[PDB]
UniProtKB/Swiss-Prot annotation:
Name of the protein in its database record: C-type lectin domain family 10 member A
Tissues where this protein is expressed: Expressed in myeloid antigen presenting cells in lymph nodes and skin (at protein level). Expressed in dermal dendritic cells (at protein level).
Native source organism of the sequence: Homo sapiens (Human)
Subcellular location: Cell membrane; Early endosome membrane; Lysosome membrane
Its biological purpose: C-type lectin receptor involved in recognition of N-acetylgalactosamine (GalNAc)-terminated glycans by myeloid antigen presenting cells (APCs). Binds in a Ca(2+)-dependent manner to alpha- and beta-linked GalNAc residues on glycoprotein and glycolipid antigens, including alphaGalNAc- and Galbeta1->3GalNAc-O-Ser/Thr also known as Tn and T antigens, LacdiNAc epitope GalNAcbeta1->4GlcNAc and its derivative GalNAcbeta1->4-(Fucalpha1->3)GlcNAc, O-linked core 5 and 6 glycans, and GM2 and GD2 gangliosides. Acts as a signaling receptor at the interface of APC-T cell interactions.
Binding residue positions for Ca(2+) 1: D90, E93, N105, D106
Binding residues annotated for a glycoprotein, in chain numbering: Q88, D90, E93, H99, N105
Record domain C-type lectin: where: 9-118
Binding site for Ca(2+) 2: V39, N41, E45, E118
Disulfides per UniProt: C2-C13, C30-C117, C95-C109
Residues of the full protein shown: 181 to 308 of 316
Binding locations of Ca(2+) 3: D64, D91, E93, D94
Length: 121
């Protein structure tokens, strides 16, 4: 089972913020909750996470520190699930966020966007 205010799907617990923070501060917040910024491993996981998104741009655990996209937990990016908006990312420090429709885009990591934490059960 998951902590109160988190939602369960398969082997993960998810928490959706109601306020915004820079990408790195969001990652620190999730780490302190024994979690990480969400890593989208599959279409099924994408579909679950996206229905809880609000209208705010929302960080995921994907960033481009040295001209290579990397998931925060070391999940392989190039062979992994991707759900970019068409033509995106077009400017690749850069961090990935969800649009309200669940598709991904990039912006600078300082923006105070909402975020999602993901933890084990
Ligand atoms: Ca995941």
């Amino acid at each position: 089972s998951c902590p109160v205010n988190w939602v369960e799907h398969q082997d993960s617990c998810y928490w959706f913020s109601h306020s915004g923070m820079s990408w790195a501060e969001a990652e620190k917040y999730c780490q302190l909750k024994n979690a990480h910024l969400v890593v989208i491993n599959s279409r099924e996981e994408q579909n679950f996470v996206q229905k809880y998104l609000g209208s705010a741009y929302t960080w995921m655990g994907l960033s481009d520190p040295e001209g290579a996209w990397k998931w925060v937990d070391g999940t392989d990016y190039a062979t992994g699930f991707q759900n970019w908006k068409p033509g995106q990312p077009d400017d690749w420090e850069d961090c990935a966020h969800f649009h309200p429709d669940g598709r991904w885009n990039d912006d600078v990591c300082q923006r105070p966007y909402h975020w999602v934490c993901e933890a084990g059960l």
